[PDB]
Amino acid sequence: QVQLQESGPGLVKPSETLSLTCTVSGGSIDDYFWNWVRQPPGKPLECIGYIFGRGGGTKYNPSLDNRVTISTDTPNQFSLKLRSVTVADTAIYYCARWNLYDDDFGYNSFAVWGRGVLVTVSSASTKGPSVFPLAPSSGGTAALGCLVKDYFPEPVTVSWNSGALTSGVHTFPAVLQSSGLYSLSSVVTVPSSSLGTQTYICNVNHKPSNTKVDKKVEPKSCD
Amino acid sequence: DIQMTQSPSSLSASVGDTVTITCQARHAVGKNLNWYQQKPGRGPQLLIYMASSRHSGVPSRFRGSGSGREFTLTINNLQPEDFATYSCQQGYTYPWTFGQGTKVEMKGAVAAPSVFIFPPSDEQLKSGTASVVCLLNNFYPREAKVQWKVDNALQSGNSQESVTEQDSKDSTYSLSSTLTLSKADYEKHKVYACEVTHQGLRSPVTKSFNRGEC
DSSP: OOEEEEESOSEEOTTSOEEEEEEEESSOSOSSEEEEEEEOTTSOOEEEEEEETTTOOEEEOGGGTTOEEEEEEETTEEEEEEOSOOGGGOEEEEEEEEOOOTTSTTTTSEEEEOOOEEEEEOOOOOBOOEEEEEOOOOOOEEEEEEEEEEEBSSOOEEEEGGGTBOTTEEEOOOEEOTTSOEEEEEEEEEEGGGGGTOOEEEEEEEGGGTEEEEEEEOOOOOO | OOOEEEEOSEEEEOTTOOEEEEEEESSOOTTOEEEEEEETTEEEEEEEETTTEEOTTOOTTEEEEEETTEEEEEEOSOOGGGOSEEEEEEOSSSSOOBOOOEEEEEOOOOBOOEEEEEOOOHHHHTTTEEEEEEEEEEEBSSOOEEEEEETTEEOOSSEEEEEOOOOTTTOOEEEEEEEEEEHHHHHTOOEEEEEEEOTTSSSOEEEEEETTOO
């Protein structure tokens, strides 16, 4: 019944200090190694550092270039500070307990993990998207879509026809533009016969700006 | 630190298959070797500790073996919930280094992409930017390449792309690529082309349009 969970800001500006807290519930901070671990996108899981017990010995990974501090500030919390962040520090951050005792499952492993928190290092400000229709020039199958451009932070979700259209939908991972804003596409393929038996609307939701847009997409015609 | 290398980085299998994932340590670590499972949107959970011991609740179809520098995770009778990423980790010396992960994907039949090209919308052009989009739809395997040209000029550095996760039923992938150009530049050129290379095609295919065409 020992559970861990990470908390703290999901956005840190470059050069600033990333701070996170792990709250242990059920149990408390006791005689284990209390660890931080991270996974940057596209990279392996990486150990950051640990502390033993309440104010016991620490150990930090040399890969973090001496930017780490870990402390146990309450009976149920331990914290991470990671100084002087850059985009290389964007990652999902996990707290985890390293099991020390040979009489339990998980000996010498991370047996208990938090769910993880995404921390992104960025100078960008919250902005809702613009939504543009995707229609190709006029084989039996048509493609239509929506381009959801210029928003921050992630995520944006897209449905079609208020959730009634799910077959053939592909909503892609966003890409980060050099402006610091994301762009994403959502497409659907449909029978070309349906291009006159059905209206197509993409429903875009950007919760961080509370922006919803319902965009009707019409096919091109040479008539 | 102790370098950990898994083989392969990704593999394809079918439900019911036996899958074997390899993990190598650059220095020997005894039996101090863990395996974890992860999914999209789900963090790691422990599968195996001490090389061969199953964590509580882990199905017996998961088997860890090996020692020293050479280890294996065997998944017998692969189930739908087992398509996931598996990582090994040495627990001998801190930092307890992880392998790069092995993604277990679904096997599928080779399928060439269906390719569609979308001009910038009139709505977008009202502003100063134009995005041209090329869709590679429902293809297998995942490797594919897009080349963009504008009036025969190779576009290099002004596109971005992304790929969906595998489709649950058909095993396929899709890819979207966006070419970004200014509105002034889009309006100064005529021919827009997306050339696609993929195993399922005997040679490249090109989809194109002339600006303004219906």
